[PDB]
Curated annotation (Swiss-Prot), chain A:
GO biological process: one example: proteasomal ubiquitin-independent protein catabolic process
Family designation: Belongs to the peptidase T1A family.
PANTHER family xref list: PROTEASOME SUBUNIT ALPHA/BETA
Compartmental location: Cytoplasm; Nucleus
Name of the protein: Proteasome subunit alpha type-5
The keyword Nucleus is annotated on this UniProt entry: yes
Swiss-Prot record, chain B:
Record's function text: The proteasome degrades poly-ubiquitinated proteins in the cytoplasm and in the nucleus. It is essential for the regulated turnover of proteins and for the removal of misfolded proteins. The proteasome is a multicatalytic proteinase complex that is characterized by its ability to cleave peptides with Arg, Phe, Tyr, Leu, and Glu adjacent to the leaving group at neutral or slightly basic pH. It has an ATP-dependent proteolytic activity.
Protein name: Proteasome subunit alpha type-6
Gene Ontology process terms (BP): proteasomal ubiquitin-independent protein catabolic process; proteasome-mediated ubiquitin-dependent protein catabolic process
Subunit-level organization: The 26S proteasome consists of a 20S proteasome core and two 19S regulatory subunits. The 20S proteasome core is composed of 28 subunits that are arranged in four stacked rings, resulting in a barrel-shaped structure. The two end rings are each formed by seven alpha subunits, and the two central rings are each formed by seven beta subunits. The catalytic chamber with the active sites is on the inside of the barrel.
Entry keywords, A to Z: Cytoplasm, Isopeptide bond, Nucleus, Phosphoprotein, Proteasome, Ubl conjugation
A single cellular component GO annotation: proteasome core complex, alpha-subunit complex
Principal location listed in the UniProt entry: cytoplasm
Extra remark beyond the main annotation: Present with 7210 molecules/cell in log phase SD medium.
Family: Belongs to the peptidase T1A family.
Phosphoprotein keyword on record: yes
Gene designation: PRE5
Swiss-Prot record, chain C:
Family: Belongs to the peptidase T1A family.
Compartment(s) where it occurs, according to its Swiss-Prot or TrEMBL record: Cytoplasm; Nucleus
UniProt-recorded name of the protein: Proteasome subunit alpha type-2
Job of this protein: The proteasome degrades poly-ubiquitinated proteins in the cytoplasm and in the nucleus. It is essential for the regulated turnover of proteins and for the removal of misfolded proteins. The proteasome is a multicatalytic proteinase complex that is characterized by its ability to cleave peptides with Arg, Phe, Tyr, Leu, and Glu adjacent to the leaving group at neutral or slightly basic pH. It has an ATP-dependent proteolytic activity.
Gene for this chain: PRE8
InterPro entries assigned: Ntn_hydrolases_N, Proteasome_alpha, Proteasome_alpha-type, Proteasome_asu_N, Proteasome_sua/b
Signal sequence, start to end: none
Assigned keywords, A-Z: Cytoplasm, Isopeptide bond, Nucleus, Proteasome, Ubl conjugation
Domain of life: Eukaryota
Gene3D superfamilies for the chain: Glutamine Phosphoribosylpyrophosphate, subunit 1, domain 1
Miscellaneous section: Present with 7060 molecules/cell in log phase SD medium.
Quaternary structure note: The 26S proteasome consists of a 20S proteasome core and two 19S regulatory subunits. The 20S proteasome core is composed of 28 subunits that are arranged in four stacked rings, resulting in a barrel-shaped structure. The two end rings are each formed by seven alpha subunits, and the two central rings are each formed by seven beta subunits. The catalytic chamber with the active sites is on the inside of the barrel.
A Pfam family annotated for this UniProt entry: Proteasome
Curated annotation (Swiss-Prot), chain F:
Protein's name according to its UniProt entry: Proteasome subunit beta type-6
Organism: Saccharomyces cerevisiae (strain ATCC 204508 / S288c)
Subcellular location: Cytoplasm; Nucleus
Family statement: Belongs to the peptidase T1B family.
Residues of the full protein shown: 20 to 130 of 241
Subunit architecture: The 26S proteasome consists of a 20S proteasome core and two 19S regulatory subunits. The 20S proteasome core is composed of 28 subunits that are arranged in four stacked rings, resulting in a barrel-shaped structure. The two end rings are each formed by seven alpha subunits, and the two central rings are each formed by seven beta subunits. The catalytic chamber with the active sites is on the inside of the barrel.
Purpose of the protein: Non-catalytic component of the proteasome which degrades poly-ubiquitinated proteins in the cytoplasm and in the nucleus. It is essential for the regulated turnover of proteins and for the removal of misfolded proteins. The proteasome is a multicatalytic proteinase complex that is characterized by its ability to cleave peptides with Arg, Phe, Tyr, Leu, and Glu adjacent to the leaving group at neutral or slightly basic pH. It has an ATP-dependent proteolytic activity.
């Protein structure tokens, strides 16, 4: 056949490029970083009405100051979150402090290219790359509120606002116009809901959509269905005005 | 022809070429441009950072290895992280065991041997990044060009990445000028900024776009970003 | 370096056939004819010494080999594959039995051990099956005289009389007509020389035919006297002169 | 490297089937027919020998019916050499249980363990599966007389009457036709021989082509006894049933 | 060492275990239950090394419960005791052995008979009508050799253990803070909460 | 039998002020009753405004200071040139010391 | 030794080995699970290709992981035993260290975690098994029902079916199960389980098995007569109209 | 299916093509070699071809000194030849250390043939494309010739031949032993046995030799040695004074 | 059929290893390098293609030293040559550790020979893309060797490999014929410069740098040293005089 870590004539890794196609099939995940906090939102996408939407866990806590959102093969993210939770706690044990968001993202991204049938370098025991993209968001005293996009390629970019999933290309173009450096936390909350509504196949409500924020004061908190429903109602009224 | 011998790095072609190595070299040409140049006192790295979106940050291109050594990347960033981390360890081993600052030439030999082992065994892939190593040791200023093939070459000036031929043609023509810039760091930076601008096509170099690093006689390896490179724009 | 052949080289085909076993059996068919006959007071195994060159010494190449003082073996197919199996069969007789029970293994269990090695060569990674069928003749106290056939698949069958190789089909038919459950050892050797004559094309003498017997104990071949229970090996390879004397009464 | 020569034994088909397992079952369908029948007072094992000769020593021959324990025995269909590998491991497992608990191993536990080893070669290792189908006949103080079967996939099921090997479809129809819940061993012996004689690919069912075993609890003993039939004992019982 | 007593009567097995945990100079606990339920009809008491005593007991408990789920069946007291013996036999020749002495008190549902097993840290199993570990037997055995009958009721067995404890509370220098008494029969395992002044 | 430990003597002193901190130590290195050196540095500047001295067995002292200075160096590489705080340094040294719990550094270290 | 990458990405972005593992589940016998107000009921169908089995000793489709958690499956029977064994060990290991029996969510997370591990490890293939995990959390009376699949994705369901003709029975449950009013009684919860299977099984008194899990480790399997009483009652509902 | 000719697995005909192609690799060097037994000696003759003038003639050799007693001549590429040479030397030293006596010629052959059988059966180790002829004067068997091939086959020889024109040398030796009726060369001195071996090399090939065209290895009691160019020259003068 | 050239250790129907012959093509594409054996030592010389004026002269050293007396030069894939020298240095250190005396040249030749030959025995390793010319002075005289990708090596009076190996071998053959008594160390260095300048005619599109090294008993005390300064310029002037 062909090696898993094989380069294409163009200069790209086959398996990594094919992994990005799997993320395109995944549910939409949007993050917006402001000076008041970083807001993360995902699409639940229930395959059946009998499926309990609250069990869908696409927003996870890494540490009190770091949150995460996933898109694509969500099962592949579980060991990545496990490593992230370990790296955050292990740093706290070694240095009696909080891990930097950039340092935490770097630790997760080091696992990405560790795949092959026996690549000469270390002991990279994995048959294939991760089929999931992560939106790592948090806060530290050094660089403040941050939003990162962790790729299966091992590369990570710091975004002011990033959208990943099925409607990622349409969402990113919308985030390009809407984002400004003076956005408030509440303005970012209605914005995540606005763009999600535009890219979701189903009508947006408190069941098929979930919000989360990370602040310096309260830390990472997942929005309950009662709190989110009021924000959907507020977003519906403001769009009805003009 | 090409389809049968490019399956893995272990396979030779009838002409004697290694296509997997050649495809890894192609990843550099797709990567962003970076320029390296030196004189007798200082060595300078000038790099053009690339962003995905206008909402994204510009990905760093220059990595510090030691107080006297550093390098700029072109291609896959994680592969540059692995090779720089190894070079950090080799510089560290020399300082701890021998109380000796590692020679830039010997550092090039170490990167050569590590890249070679990835090209002779099954299952492995070549590194998808080109590196420009600068350093000041007991023999003066140095500049070395690392290639995934293993080939490392000591140069006065060089450039790798997209449209890098324009910068390389400039440095070849300006060869006699920037070599004599001794005891003046700022003028050597300006020679590198003018070199990297010869490769520009899409946009002009801006504040959060340009990345410059320098190491010299009485100057430790320091990276300048953002406001620190505004005077060279 | 490092064996990357960790997968099976023998696999099931759509028809259910195990290709590499079938092809190994085909290699046995190309091999020189070897036979075995079990009598009431002994077992006889015989084969043709197919010399590649008249310059080569046929005495140095032994197609019939001693496994234990009571057990012998002969083959058909690939020579090199047989020789290594004999080395393994001799070692497994000690390591798995004699160093445990203080005595030599019975024929049926030694055959079982050889069959295990040949089975593993069908399932293990990075190996091909042995291109040989073995005829193992032996004696033990509780089972008496026995003859076994071991195939490349690892399957083994007890035989009264059988043949394997080039003219096995023609030899088995000849053995069925001449065999009876009242045959003496000397009679069994007489049929052995008659059955092998139909397979050999060129010269038929003691220098071109290799023959050994499993019969009575040989105190002269023991090498020492003293212990009453030790009465000597039952395996005896017949010399060139001993074969020629029986060929005159053919 | 070696990737070129890898047959990939442990992969799914587009349909969701396991190639090597399905092809192994095809190999079994050519091997000699083995039938097991469970009665109220014992179990009957009957097997048809594949490829026989006049000069084949039947008295010392064992290819289909093997003894695992004093209470558990097996009927083999497929590769004999592959079976002996599994038979040996089952013998060690039975003795491991007896050493640990000071009690004889319940039939199902021995069956599950062998089936788990078969499953191992199906999921990982890159090696070919065992081309063997077992019929387990055993007794324990929990369920009493038990009859199981296992195939190359590692799947096992409990039965009242089952056939493995060649002509199973025809053999299972005949067993389902004559079997009742209140059967006696003597009746089960007859059914097993009658089913084989009708599904035989050869001219006539004779003693030199058969292996027979019965597992019965002796009324004048109170303990379960295994009886692997001798060539003469198979010859006698073949005449009594009406086959001669 | 701690007090670990066992007696097998007509229809049940009675285990008496001391409540004291002594570490160096102080009695840290006077209500410690030195027993674990392995299965609904099998109970094991234990004494020995400070850390090994509970670690081994819970290890066996986990294994028996793993078997009970897998087979949907309860192992006989004999089968359990043989498993415990082998684990202690493997331990005795390891890097650091389990220094734990155990008493298996179980009721066989198939046999309808109570059974008591005694295994020490070495792995010495013995089926006994009555058993004790350490110095416990030195004071008790003569009373047990005298009064014990196979046809004794549960009430009679409790009276004999009371006499055994009274001898221990008189002649033995260590204060073991009384005993917890448990009954193992056909209905399962129950604890006698009124042994302090029975 | 070979004894892996030794006593190089010396004494170190660390006093924390309101907005300052001092770490003193004598420059005398000894073995039994002989003076090895009259001037042998014992208090070292490790970077990030942190000073360190590990007094006792000098070979263990030099190894610990050398390994901590290297830990500061790697803290800059891994965490984007972040300054190592005094509490973070203290916790880091604990793991450096407890890593050799069953074959300890025979030193009394103060930062 | 063997570490060949079997589960890999394709040009379109699918893992074919995981994709074909779902096809093995589609071949396996139908398994359904419904949760009421105070109970969860698991129902599985039996094959009718060969009919001469001993129902006493034949491994049942519903397996107990612990005294409070049960597991049913659809797909390869041999692969399921591996997942069942590992779940049973983890259940005992959790009781040993945490001193409290597993929650249904945790046991599901473990089983799905094992399945996911086999989708990106060299030399192994994914399990051709989807599982339905049902039960009650320790000291809790709230019904729990979960589903896993070869990929490693798990989620909780009010009602779910897996296996052959699972598309038909899912459409039945979507128009019959009410979230506003779940089956309040155990009897009506079992009734809905049989009703959903009768759409697929096509008249099978011996072909349907029912297992009911109640709070505080109360699991009981219904006999052939008990299930047949429901079948007789349901068939009367159709005939009276 | 078509990879049966790429690795050491059986073809439908029951053949091993990789082994068969390894036999074809033995004739790549285009060198003929023969071995003959004397009364108390063993002589190997091998063709010496130096095509390039830049080559050092003293290094161009296909005869190896394995032990004090055993010598080996190889037919096939020199990288595989020296691979088999180093292994044979290692086995000879180990045998003496473990068993207290010098390894016999036939035992070394059997050992090297067993190793070649492993490459015939196991997939990852390729067969060496060389034929090894071992020669010595054994303390029990006397003059000994034992030859191994890529198949793992080995047998004793009264006399042997190996190379592209092997058949011509074999039949030429065959016709002499039919005439003499004895298995060895009836001569006291080894010098005349070398002379015999050279003469029959000429008669079979139909080519005259110089001192630099041949390579001679002589095995005597407790010693094996290779002849120099001047030693062969002395031997060529003696046969020239006969014809 | 076809496909014998795709894997390494696979024999083609003609008994050839194509992957090794494909590695020879990489050597033939590479830079020309030479070796001359004189009366008491050896002289090594290599061409250094100047790709750009940006390359720092006298810095990118191609000739490598093993131990203190052996010099190595190679043609083809430069990193592959370094890997072989790294092994050679480990093998030389292993010899000196056990046997005290520095490794003899025939001894060192076999050590590299076996290592390169080992890379032709497996399908998991790639053959070396270099032909290495090496040698020095030991216990008895000087030695010169050339090692091929197959592992094949011989002793040489003069060695040549690379782009212009034909022109180099022809010029070396003239030296062997005209000097039967033996060339001197001084003359060999001057001649080594002349050989490359004439061999550069096959790659005369690009500028080149000269690099000579030598190991002589009387001139360098049997140690490997690089030709530097006045002696290097004297060689260049000798070559530039006879090029016209």
């Amino acid at each position: 056949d062909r090696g898993v870590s094989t380069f294409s004539p163009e200069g790209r890794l086959f398996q990594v490029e094919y992994s990005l196609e799997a993320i395109k099939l995944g549910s939409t995940a949007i993050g917006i970083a402001t000076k008041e906090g970083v807001v993360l939102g995902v699409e639940k996408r229930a395959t059946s009405p009998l499926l309990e939407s609250d069990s869908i866990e696409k927003i996870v806590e890494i540490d009190r100051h770091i949150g995460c959102a996933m898109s694509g093969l969500t099962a592949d993210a579980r060991s990545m979150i496990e490593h992230a939770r370990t790296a955050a706690v292990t740093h706290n044990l070694y240095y009696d402090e909080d891990i930097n968001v950039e340092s935490l993202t770097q630790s997760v991204c080091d696992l990405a290219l560790r795949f092959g049938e026996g690549a000469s370098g270390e002991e990279r025991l994995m048959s294939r790359p991760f089929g999931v993209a992560l939106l790592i968001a948090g806060h530290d005293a050094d660089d403040g509120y941050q939003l990162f996009h962790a790729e299966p390629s091992g590369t990570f970019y710091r975004y002011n606002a990033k959208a990943i999933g099925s409607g990622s290309e349409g969402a990113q173009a919308e985030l390009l116009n809407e984002w400004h450096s003076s956005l408030t936390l509440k303005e970012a909350e209605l914005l995540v809901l606005k763009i999600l509504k535009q890219v979701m196949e189903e009508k947006l409500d408190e069941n098929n959509a979930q919000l989360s924020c990370i602040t310096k004061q309260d830390g990472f908190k997942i929005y309950d269905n009662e709190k989110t429903a009021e924000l959907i109602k507020e977003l519906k009224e403001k769009e009805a005005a003009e | 022809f090409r389809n049968n011998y490019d399956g893995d790095t272990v396979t030779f072609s009838p002409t004697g070429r290694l296509f997997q190595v050649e495809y890894a070299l192609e990843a550099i040409k797709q990567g962003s441009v970076t320029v390296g140049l030196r004189s007798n006192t200082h060595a300078v790295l000038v790099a053009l950072k690339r962003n995905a979106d206008e909402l994204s940050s510009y990905q760093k291109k220059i990595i510090k290895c030691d107080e006297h050594m550093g390098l700029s990347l072109a291609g896959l960033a994680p592969d540059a992280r692995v090779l720089s981390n190894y070079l950090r360890q080799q510089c560290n081993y020399s300082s701890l065991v021998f109380n000796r600052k590692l020679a830039v030439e010997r550092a090039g030999h170490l990167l050569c041997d590590k890249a070679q082992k990835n090209t002779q065994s099954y299952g492995g892939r070549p590194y998808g990044v080109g590196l420009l190593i600068i350093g000041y040791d007991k023999s003066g200023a140095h500049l070395l060009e690392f290639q995934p093939s293993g080939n490392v070459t000591e140069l006065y000036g060089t450039a790798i990445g997209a449209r890098s031929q324009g910068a390389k043609t400039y440095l070849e023509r300006t060869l006699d000028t920037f070599i004599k810039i001794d005891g003046n760091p700022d003028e050597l930076i300006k020679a590198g900024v003018e070199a990297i601008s010869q490769s520009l096509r899409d946009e002009s170099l801006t504040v959060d776009n340009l990345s410059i690093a320098i190491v010299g006689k009485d100057t430790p390896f320091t990276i300048y970003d953002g406001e620190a490179v505004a005077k060279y724009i | 370096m490092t064996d990357r052949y960790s997968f099976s080289l023998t696999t099931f085909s759509p028809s259910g056939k195990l290709g590499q076993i079938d092809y190994a059996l085909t290699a046995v068919k190309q091999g020189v004819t070897s036979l075995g006959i079990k009598a009431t007071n002994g077992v006889v195994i015989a084969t043709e010494k197919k010399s590649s060159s008249p310059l080569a010494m046929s005495e140095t190449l032994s197609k019939v080999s001693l496994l234990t003082p009571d057990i012998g073996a002969v083959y058909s197919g690939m020579g090199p594959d047989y020789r290594v199996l004999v080395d393994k069969s001799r070692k497994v007789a000690h390591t798995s039995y004699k160093r445990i029970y203080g005595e030599y293994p019975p024929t049926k269990l030694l055959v079982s051990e050889v069959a295990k090695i040949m089975q593993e060569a069908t399932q293990s990674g990075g190996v091909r099956p042995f291109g040989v069928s073995l005829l193992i003749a032996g004696h033990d106290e509780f089972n008496g005289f026995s003859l076994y056939q071991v195939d490349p698949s690892g399957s083994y069958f007890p035989w009264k009389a059988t043949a394997i190789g080039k003219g096995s089909v023609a030899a088995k038919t000849f053995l069925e007509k001449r065999w009876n459950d009242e045959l003496e050892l000397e009679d069994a050797i007489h049929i052995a020389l008659l059955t092998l004559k139909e397979s050999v094309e060129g010269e038929f003498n003691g220098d071109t035919i290799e023959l050994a017997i499993i019969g009575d104990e040989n105190p002269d071949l023991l090498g020492y006297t003293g212990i009453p229970t030790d009465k000597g090996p039952r395996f005896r390879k017949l010399t060139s002169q001993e074969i020629n004397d029986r060929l005159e009464a053919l | 490297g070696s990737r070129r020569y890898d047959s990939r034994t442990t992969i799914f088909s587009p349909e969701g089937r396991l190639y090597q397992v399905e092809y192994a079952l095809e190999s079994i369908s050519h091997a000699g027919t083995a039938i097991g029948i469970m009665a109220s007072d014992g179990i009957v094992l009957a097997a048809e020998r594949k490829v026989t000769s006049t000069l084949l020593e039947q008295d010392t021959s064992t290819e289909k019916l093997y003894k695992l324990n004093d209470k558990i025995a097996v009927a083999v269909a497929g590769l004999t050499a592959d079976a002996e590998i599994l038979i040996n491991t089952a013998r060690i497992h039975a003795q491991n249980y007896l050493k640990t608990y000071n009690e004889d191993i319940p039939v199902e536990i021995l069956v599950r363990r062998l089936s788990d080893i078969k499953q191992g070669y199906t999921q990982h290792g890159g090696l070919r599966p065992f081309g063997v189908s077992f019929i387990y006949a055993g007794y324990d103080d929990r369920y009493g007389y038990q009859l199981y079967t296992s195939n190359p996939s590692g799947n096992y099921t409990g039965w009242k009457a089952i056939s493995v090997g060649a002509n199973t479809s025809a053999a299972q129809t005949l067993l389902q036709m004559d079997y009742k819940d209140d059967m006696k061993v003597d009746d089960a012996i007859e059914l097993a021989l009658k089913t084989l004689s009708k599904t035989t690919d050869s001219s006539a069912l004779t003693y030199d082509r058969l292996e027979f075993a019965t597992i019965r609890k002796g009324a004048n003993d109170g303990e379960v006894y295994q009886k692997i039939f001798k060539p003469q004992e198979i010859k006698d019982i073949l005449v009594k049933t009406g086959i001669t | 060492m701690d007090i670990i007593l066992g007696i097998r009567v007509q229809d049940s097995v009675i285990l008496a275990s001391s409540k004291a945990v002594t570490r160096g100079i102080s009695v840290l606990k006077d209500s410690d239950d030195k027993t674990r339920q392995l299965s609904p009809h099998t109970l094991m008491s234990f004494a020995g090394e400070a850390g090994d005593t509970v670690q081994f007991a819970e290890y066996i408990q986990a294994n028996i419960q793993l078997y009970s789920i897998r087979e949907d069946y309860e192992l006989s007291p004999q089968a359990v005791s043989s498993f415990v013996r082998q684990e202690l036999a493997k331990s005795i020749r390891s890097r650091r052995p389990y220094q734990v002495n155990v008493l298996i008190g179980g009721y066989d549902k198939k046999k309808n008979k109570p059974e008591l097993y005694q295994i020490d840290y070495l792995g010495t199993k013995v089926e006994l009508p009555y058993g004790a570990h350490g110095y416990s037997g030195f004071y008790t055995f003569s009373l047990l050799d005298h009064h014990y009958r196979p046809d004794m009721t549960t009430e009679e067995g409790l009276d004999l253990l009371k006499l055994c404890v009274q001898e221990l509370e008189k002649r033995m220098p260590m204060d073991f803070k009384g005993v917890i008494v448990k009954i193992v029969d056909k209905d399962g395992i129950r604890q006698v909460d009124d042994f302090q002044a029975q | 039998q070979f004894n892996p430990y030794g006593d190089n003597g010396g004494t170190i002193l660390g006093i924390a002020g309101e907005d300052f901190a001092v770490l003193a130590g004598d420059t005398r290195n000894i073995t039994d009753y002989s003076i090895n050196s009259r001037y042998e540095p014992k208090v070292f500047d490790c970077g990030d405004n942190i000073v360190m001295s590990a007094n006792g067995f000098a070979a263990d002292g030099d190894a610990l200071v050398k390994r901590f200075k290297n830990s500061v160096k790697w803290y800059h590489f891994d965490h984007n040139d972040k300054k190592l705080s005094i509490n973070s340094a203290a916790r880091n040294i604990q793991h450096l010391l407890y890593g050799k719990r069953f074959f300890p550094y025979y030193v009394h270290t103060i930062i | 030794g063997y570490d060949r990458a079997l589960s890999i990405f394709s040009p379109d972005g699918h893992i074919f080995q995981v994709e074909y593992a779902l096809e093995a589940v589609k071949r396996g016998t139908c398994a359904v699970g419904v949760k009421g107000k105070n109970c969860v009921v698991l129902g599985c169908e039996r094959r009718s290709t060969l009919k001469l089995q001993d129902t006493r000793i034949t491994p049942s489709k519903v397996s107990k992981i612990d005294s409070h958690v049960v597991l049913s499956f659809s797909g390869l029977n041999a692969d399921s035993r591996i997942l069942i064994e590992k779940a049973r060990v983890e259940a005992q290991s959790h009781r040993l260290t945490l001193e409290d029996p597993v929650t249904v969510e945790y046991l599901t997370r473990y089983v799905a975690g094992v399945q996911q591990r086999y989708t990106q490890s060299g030399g192994v293939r994914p399990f051709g098994v989807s599982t339905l995990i049902a039960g009650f959390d320790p000291r809790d009376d709230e019904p729990k029902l979960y589903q896993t699949e070869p990929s490693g994705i798990y989620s909780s369901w009010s009602a779910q079916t897996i296996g052959r003709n699972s598309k038909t029975v899912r459409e039945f449950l979507e128009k019959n199960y009410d979230r506003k009013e779940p089956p309040a009684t155990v009897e009506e919860c079992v009734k809905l389980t049989v009703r959903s299977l009768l759409e697929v099984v096509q008249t099978g008194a011996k072909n349907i098995e029912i297992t009911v899990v109640k709070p505080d480790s109360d699991i009981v399997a219904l006999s052939s007569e008990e299930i047949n009483q429901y079948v007789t009652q349901i068939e009367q509902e159709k005939q009276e109209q | 299916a078509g990879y049966d000719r790429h690795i050491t697995i059986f073809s439908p005909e029951g053949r091993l093509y990789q082994v068969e192609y390894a036999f074809k690799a033995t004739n790549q060097t285009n060198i003929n070699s023969l071995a003959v037994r004397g009364k108390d000696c063993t002589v190997v003759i091998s063709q010496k071809k130096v095509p390039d003038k830049l080559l050092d003639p003293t290094t161009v050799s296909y005869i190896f000194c394995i032990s004090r007693t055993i010598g080996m001549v190889v037919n096939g590429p020199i990288p595989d030849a020296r691979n088999a040479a180093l292994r044979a030397k290692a086995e000879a030293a180990e045998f003496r250390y473990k068993y207290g006596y010098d390894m016999p010629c036939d035992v070394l052959a059997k050992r090297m043939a067993n190793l070649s059988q492993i490459y015939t059966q196991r997939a990852y180790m390729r067969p060496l494309g060389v034929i090894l002829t071992f020669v010595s004067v054994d303390e029990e068997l006397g003059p000994s010739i034992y030859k191994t091939d890529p198949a793992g086959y080995y047998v004793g020889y009264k006399a042997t031949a190996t190379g592209p024109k092997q058949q011509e040398i074999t039949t030429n030796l065959e016709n002499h032993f039919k005439k003499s009726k004895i298995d060895h060369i009836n001569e006291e001195s080894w010098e005349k046995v070398v002379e015999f071996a050279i003469t029959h090399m000429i008669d079979a090939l139909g080519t005259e030799f110089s001192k630099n065209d041949l390579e001679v290895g002589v095995a005597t009691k407790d010693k094996f040695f290779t002849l120099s160019a001047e030693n062969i020259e002395e031997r060529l003068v003696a046969i020239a004074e006969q014809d | 059929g076809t496909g014998y050239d795709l894997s390494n250790s696979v024999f083609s129907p003609d008994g050839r290893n194509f992957q090794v012959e494909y590695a020879v093509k990489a050597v033939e594409n590479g830079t020309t390098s030479i070796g001359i054996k004189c009366n008491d030592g050896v002289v090594f010389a290599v061409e250094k293609l100047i790709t750009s004026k940006l390359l720092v002269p006298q810095k990118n050293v191609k000739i490598q030293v093993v131990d203190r007396h052996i010099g190595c030069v190679y043609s083809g894939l430069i990193p592959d040559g370094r890997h072989l020298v790294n092994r050679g240095r480990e093998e030389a250190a292993s010899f000196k550790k056990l046997y005290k005396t520095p490794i003899p040249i025939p001894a060192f030749a076999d050590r590299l020979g076996q290592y390169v030959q080992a890379h032709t025995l497996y399908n998991s390793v790639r053959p070396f893309g270099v032909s290495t010319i090496f040698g020095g002075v030991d216990k008895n005289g000087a030695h010169l060797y050339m090692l091929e990708p197959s592992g094949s090596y011989w002793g040489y009076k003069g060695a040549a490999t690379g782009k212009g190996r034909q022109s180099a071998k022809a010029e070396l053959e003239k030296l062997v014929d005209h000097h039967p008594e033996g060339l001197s160390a001084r003359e060999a260095v001057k001649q080594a410069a002349k050989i490359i300048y004439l061999a550069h005619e096959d790659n005369k599109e690009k500028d080149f740098e000269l690099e000579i090294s030598w190991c002589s008993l009387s001139e360098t005390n049997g140690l490997h040293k690089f030709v530097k300064g006045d002696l290097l310029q004297e060689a260049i002037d000798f070559a530039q005089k006879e090029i016209n």
